[PDB]
Design a protein around this ligand. Sequence first.
Ligand SMILES: *[C@@H]1O[C@H](CO)[C@@H](O[C@@H]2O[C@H](CO)[C@@H](O[C@@H]3O[C@H](CO)[C@@H](O)[C@H](O)[C@@H]3O)[C@H](O)[C@H]2NC(C)=O)[C@H](O)[C@H]1NC(C)=O
Ligand SMILES: *[C@@H]1O[C@H](CO)[C@@H](O[C@@H]2O[C@H](CO)[C@@H](O[C@@H]3O[C@H](CO)[C@@H](O)[C@H](O)[C@@H]3O)[C@H](O)[C@H]2NC(C)=O)[C@H](O)[C@H]1NC(C)=O
Ligand SMILES: *[C@@H]1O[C@H](CO)[C@@H](O)[C@H](O)[C@H]1NC(C)=O
Ligand SMILES: *[C@@H]1O[C@H](CO)[C@@H](O)[C@H](O)[C@H]1NC(C)=O
Ligand SMILES: *[C@@H]1O[C@H](CO)[C@@H](O)[C@H](O)[C@H]1NC(C)=O
Ligand SMILES: *[C@@H]1O[C@H](CO)[C@@H](O)[C@H](O)[C@H]1NC(C)=O
Ligand SMILES: *[C@@H]1O[C@H](CO)[C@@H](O)[C@H](O)[C@H]1NC(C)=O
Ligand SMILES: *[C@@H]1O[C@H](CO)[C@@H](O)[C@H](O)[C@H]1NC(C)=O
Ligand SMILES: *[C@H]1O[C@H](CO)[C@@H](O)[C@H](O)[C@@H]1O
Ligand SMILES: *[C@H]1O[C@H](CO)[C@@H](O)[C@H](O)[C@@H]1O
Ligand SMILES: [Cu+2]
Ligand SMILES: [Cu+2]
Ligand SMILES: [Cu+2]
Ligand SMILES: [Cu+2]
Lengths: 372, 372
Amino acid sequence: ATLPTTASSSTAVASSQLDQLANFAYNVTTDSVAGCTLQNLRVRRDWRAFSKTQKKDYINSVLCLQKLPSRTPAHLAPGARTRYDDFVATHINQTQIIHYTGTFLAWHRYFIYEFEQALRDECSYTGDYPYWNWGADADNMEKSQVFDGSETSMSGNGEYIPNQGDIKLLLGNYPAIDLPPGSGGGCVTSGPFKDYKLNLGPAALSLPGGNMTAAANPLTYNPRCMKRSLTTEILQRYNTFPKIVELILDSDDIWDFQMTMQGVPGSGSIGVHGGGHYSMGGDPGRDVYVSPGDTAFWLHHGMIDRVWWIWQNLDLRKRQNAISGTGTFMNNPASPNTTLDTVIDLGYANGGPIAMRDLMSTTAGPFCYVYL
Amino acid sequence: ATLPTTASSSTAVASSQLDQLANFAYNVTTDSVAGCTLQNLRVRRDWRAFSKTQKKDYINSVLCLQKLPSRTPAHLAPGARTRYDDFVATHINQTQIIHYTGTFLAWHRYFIYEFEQALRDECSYTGDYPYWNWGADADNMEKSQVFDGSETSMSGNGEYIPNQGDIKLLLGNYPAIDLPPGSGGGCVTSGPFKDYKLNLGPAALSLPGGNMTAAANPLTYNPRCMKRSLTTEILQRYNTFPKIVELILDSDDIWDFQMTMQGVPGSGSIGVHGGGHYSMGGDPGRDVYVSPGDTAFWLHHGMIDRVWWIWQNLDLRKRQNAISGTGTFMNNPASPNTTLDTVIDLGYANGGPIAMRDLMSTTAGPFCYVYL
Ligand SMILES: *[C@@H]1O[C@H](CO)[C@@H](O[C@@H]2O[C@H](CO)[C@@H](O[C@@H]3O[C@H](CO)[C@@H](O)[C@H](O)[C@@H]3O)[C@H](O)[C@H]2NC(C)=O)[C@H](O)[C@H]1NC(C)=O
Ligand SMILES: *[C@@H]1O[C@H](CO)[C@@H](O[C@@H]2O[C@H](CO)[C@@H](O[C@@H]3O[C@H](CO)[C@@H](O)[C@H](O)[C@@H]3O)[C@H](O)[C@H]2NC(C)=O)[C@H](O)[C@H]1NC(C)=O
Ligand SMILES: *[C@@H]1O[C@H](CO)[C@@H](O)[C@H](O)[C@H]1NC(C)=O
Ligand SMILES: *[C@@H]1O[C@H](CO)[C@@H](O)[C@H](O)[C@H]1NC(C)=O
Ligand SMILES: *[C@@H]1O[C@H](CO)[C@@H](O)[C@H](O)[C@H]1NC(C)=O
Ligand SMILES: *[C@@H]1O[C@H](CO)[C@@H](O)[C@H](O)[C@H]1NC(C)=O
Ligand SMILES: *[C@@H]1O[C@H](CO)[C@@H](O)[C@H](O)[C@H]1NC(C)=O
Ligand SMILES: *[C@@H]1O[C@H](CO)[C@@H](O)[C@H](O)[C@H]1NC(C)=O
Ligand SMILES: *[C@H]1O[C@H](CO)[C@@H](O)[C@H](O)[C@@H]1O
Ligand SMILES: *[C@H]1O[C@H](CO)[C@@H](O)[C@H](O)[C@@H]1O
Ligand SMILES: [Cu+2]
Ligand SMILES: [Cu+2]
Ligand SMILES: [Cu+2]
Ligand SMILES: [Cu+2]
């Protein structure tokens, strides 16, 4: 079998191209497994592949972390109430050193893995890690099994608010990127997270109209509802199967991969990573720091990690350990290059400090899983 | 009298142009003074204008802050030992929100004012705030009364180190700016600060050759000598009287002023602000975060504040309260615009929280001084 070399403009085959690439990556991962053996190798799976009661087992475990008390010392994050908040808080705390950095991909890989460990160790979860395949939902976000509002979604849309202005995304002094406000605006109307209390932020919440709300200290207590405004137009622009495959096949090195993924500034594109986030609309959906406060975050980054994993396995010799970038957001201010010895941590959320070299592979260090 | 409209290429008259502009600014400030009256109005003065024993009164007060114990809670900055360290620590702590921000100019104005208050309130200083006029020293940094190594300098050059590679200044992914390493390299050889213990950092120290050293936590204890490597070539490139006047006269709004001053990224220029800093070479001279750990910092920023003050007084109606920019370094990540209500503080160094509106004028809020 010879793999696709050029992304198709046809949605139907772009999807199949993606599946081929994934199959190859799956093949590479499995037979390289012949700590981590084929036996104890976990499989992360598309949300759609979960059955009703499996969906709910996951949801319930998450609701469990949203009920268990926070481990973060109150004086460090006064707003944190739950174990779940512990994760949100560390993400807020470290936002300026984990996006547009050399550590971005590996940090989020570790973040979601440790989230998973919390689910298993504290909330008795025994099911698989879920991911959200953007491409399948690119035409109707409201019908996504992740966002349909049912008892098996991560809740759905937010209360509709008429005539919201556009979202204006800034970075540096580049011209804004303009996005539609979606079909919601307010508190989520249904599903398992309808009564979920969002406790932290806003740190930097983009608002319809172009304004931004920012607490003096986004780690203080600010209990409020989760708001969404599902915006299908955004997925259509940045997260279609052709766009996904394009990112994989046109990215010749780790720099181009991660930059294309996140959206290079000034380019008018926010990539699959930005698209996934901003398509949720609402709050913290539109807050780069507080985004894990939206429960769909974990599924989104499941998919982010998948896409990275695929890209790596297309040329494992060159890509397995590939790193580019520094330890500061867009290298502002300048910091040293990230290396295999760079140490990251998730503060009080879970786990301990760990070096980049131990994160590069989904079947070494603490990791032992594959994506189906 | 009609003021210069175009910066002269002649060093001799560029200097006189500067003096005219300063005189005008002085005139505006005084007669606008007709809390702050002409009576209690302080005058900040060129270091050269200080007599021997006045120089030493200032130096001694600084050495006093370098001996009095730190107020910063040990658990917040384990490295801080002295009152002086309190200031360095807050600067390190806030570096990512006080450079390339809307607050940059006003924050540093408040920083040095509160430094001054520490000198007066804790170290019995009663003399004037000094500033370093770069232009007078642009041809021979070693002969500067600030850096001559005598008992009236801020110490002088560092131990000479042969064949140091160039300094390579990065920001974002723009091409590096290359600078010569100067005539020193090591510990300062003489003057009042020869035994001054530099306690904090490095946070991001640029090294000859292009490398950068960064502690895991630059607020922890790392006692070592202050190192300089006086680099006249740098002042010659960025800090000549023509360059100073150019910044004043060619900058039509606050954005262009502050950006030209700091060096716009990608432009190959580091402005009078970068030039002043990097011309000192050494450590923390080449560390954006830790720079106040070099005792010349206060004189440099005296001059920075002067240049701003002059520019403001050229059109006080439009410039007095002018602000542009956000609350994050180069607006990475994006944050709200700075406004007159934006509140800043210097943590434990001195003073309390204060709004931008109270900082805009050297003769309102807490301020009541002029530059001669
Ligand atoms: C947000 O990030 C900052 C910066 O990393 C975190 O501050 C860090 O806090 C921990 C302790 O709270 C420090 O760890 C060290 O622990 C050992 C004891 O095992 C002790 O010997 C050290 O002196 C230190 O306390 C870490 O150095 C410290 N870093 C800084 C710059 O203060 C903070 O915890 C994070 N906030 C949250 C809520 O996670
Ligand atoms: C570096 O900057 C951080 C962020 O500003 C500083 O953390 C801040 O620390 C102070 C107290 O240490 C917090 O002030 C508040 O004081 C009142 C009591 O008057 C209390 O009710 C509040 O809950 C809070 O403790 C401030 O909110 C806090 N901010 C964060 C994000 O933790 C830190 O102090 C700075 N480090 C140094 C050495 O200056
Ligand atoms: C994966 O390996 C299987 C089993 O040998 C093979 O049939 C299939 O063609 C491989 N997939 C790809 C995309 O190479
Ligand atoms: C956005 O901010 C401006 C300036 O503070 C304010 O006047 C306005 O009310 C805000 N606009 C919206 C859409 O709320
Ligand atoms: C931020 O200020 C700039 C001018 O410096 C202005 O163009 C922009 O509209 C402001 N942003 C908002 C949303 O207020
Ligand atoms: C400053 O005011 C004095 C006193 O009237 C005047 O002689 C001088 O010309 C003024 N300076 C400038 C530069 O306008
Ligand atoms: C700079 O860093 C490189 C890579 O770590 C190292 O090999 C080298 O020793 C350093 N160069 C200098 C000039 O010390
Ligand atoms: C940082 O890494 C880049 C490649 O991504 C390399 O070009 C540069 O030399 C590195 N910086 C240093 C000084 O090691
Ligand atoms: C296939 O459908 C996608 C949306 O899923 C479009 O983006 C593409 O142009 C093609 O029509
Ligand atoms: C006057 O002298 C300055 C240095 O002080 C030069 O930069 C300028 O070109 C002129 O020779
Ligand atoms: Cu993140
Ligand atoms: Cu993300
Ligand atoms: Cu500064
Ligand atoms: Cu400075």
